[PDB]
Symmetry: C2
Subunit: 124 residues, 2 copies
């Protein structure tokens, strides 16, 4: 989950591009809260076949539920309200199209790398 | 402490209502990142005079840019992302009618005090 760490140290003139990579399907809250879990899997691979996307999506929902219990401890009402919304949004839209949500995540991670490659080679 | 914290430390039964209260009217992100400032404002008055509402509004935005300023150097991209969502939300929906948000936020706080009382009276 170091990729999210790098992105947090992005140069001030790249953040707006970073803020735009996320969306209601893949909120930035999700990208951070489960960054470890997210970076553990090959998303391009999970998006290649329906079988892989179906399982990944099933577990994403599990990780979101596991985090819901986490912020429930912290009394992080805010983040309980967010994950609650996020989970409901993901279910109604991707429970019959797990490949679609997989593509989105895959695309975002590719974009984060592509963005980092710009800032990285921007040291000349 | 703030009235927001007192609400966070509420029974799981009271939270459901706390969440239903911020489903539409205004983002709980705002209610939380600016709880101190939000609570230190006469919204009932700001709701009756348009010019005052515009000025309280201008101030709310100012407070946002202040935090956004800090979070920018602390490299807390997720917090910046929340603030950014608040501005776009306020900019499009209340810049041309600040008195509206003035009423909404006024109401919400009125509804929060109710939760604090029902919860307090439940201490018997
Ligand atoms: Ni000004």
């Amino acid at each position: 989950g170091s990729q999210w760490n790098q992105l947090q140290q992005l140069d001030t003139r790249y953040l707006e591009q970073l803020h735009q990579l996320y969306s209601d399907s893949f909120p930035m809250e999700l990208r951070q809260f489960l960054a470890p879990w997210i970076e553990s899997q090959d998303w391009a691979y999970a998006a290649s076949k329906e079988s892989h996307a179906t399982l990944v999506f099933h577990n994403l929902l599990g990780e979101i539920d596991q985090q819901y219990s986490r912020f429930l401890q912290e009394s992080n009402v805010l983040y309980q309200h967010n994950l609650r919304r996020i989970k409901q949004f993901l279910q109604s839209r991707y429970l019959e199209k797990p490949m679609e949500i997989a593509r989105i995540v895959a695309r975002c991670l590719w974009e984060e790398s592509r963005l980092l490659q710009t800032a990285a080679t921007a040291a000349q």
